[PDB]
């Protein structure tokens, strides 16, 4: 069908781990850059 489809590449982003001081705490926060969690 003579229709136009835009192609944008698969989402990629550096995973950054937000870590409070290991002695202070053990919980973890993970960051997915420039990606909405709907895709995640």
């Amino acid at each position: 069908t003579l229709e136009i489809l835009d192609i944008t590449p698969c989402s990629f982003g550096g995973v950054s781990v937000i870590t409070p001081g290991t002695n202070t705490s053990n919980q973890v926060a993970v960051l997915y850059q420039d990606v909405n969690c709907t895709e995640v």
């Binding site: 944008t8 990629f12 982003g13 850059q33 420039d34």
Partner: peptide, 22 residues
């Protein structure tokens, strides 16, 4: 004043509105 093969533009920590606030 007026790139997807693994090249990522990390946003500034201070947003343009926040830089304007400074």
């Amino acid at each position: 004043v007026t790139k997807f093969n693994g090249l990522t533009v990390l946003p500034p920590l201070l947003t343009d509105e926040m830089i304007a606030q400074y």
